[PDB]
Amino acid sequence: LDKILNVEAMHTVLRALKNTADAMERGLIHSFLQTLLRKAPPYFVVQTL
């Protein structure tokens, strides 16, 4: 009863931690894209220059 409840709570915390780790890596991808798009001028400016 006690050990199975603590293993179930460990599984809950483990699924939440894996969710948060995936969300952090997707957030790093997203913030890198949003700081790469504010560095990218359009094609006609670079082609003219």
């Binding site: 699924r15 969710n19 995936d22 969300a23 997707r26």
Partner: protein, 49 residues
């Protein structure tokens, strides 16, 4: 005389569920009874990334 040469019975080809490729969209599970199963419900533990 009136001849009767050959008598032919058609051998119809059998077809089953799991031999058919339609079973790839099916997690085919056999229970025992549904005389008491009024609401046979499955719960889910999906995750949103």
């Amino acid at each position: 005389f009136e001849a009767i040469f050959g008598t032919f019975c058609n051998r119809l080809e059998w077809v089953y569920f799991l031999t058919s490729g339609l079973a790839a969209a099916a997690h085919a599970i056999k229970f025992h009874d549904l005389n008491k199963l009024t609401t046979g419900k499955m719960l889910f533990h999906v995750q949103v990334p």
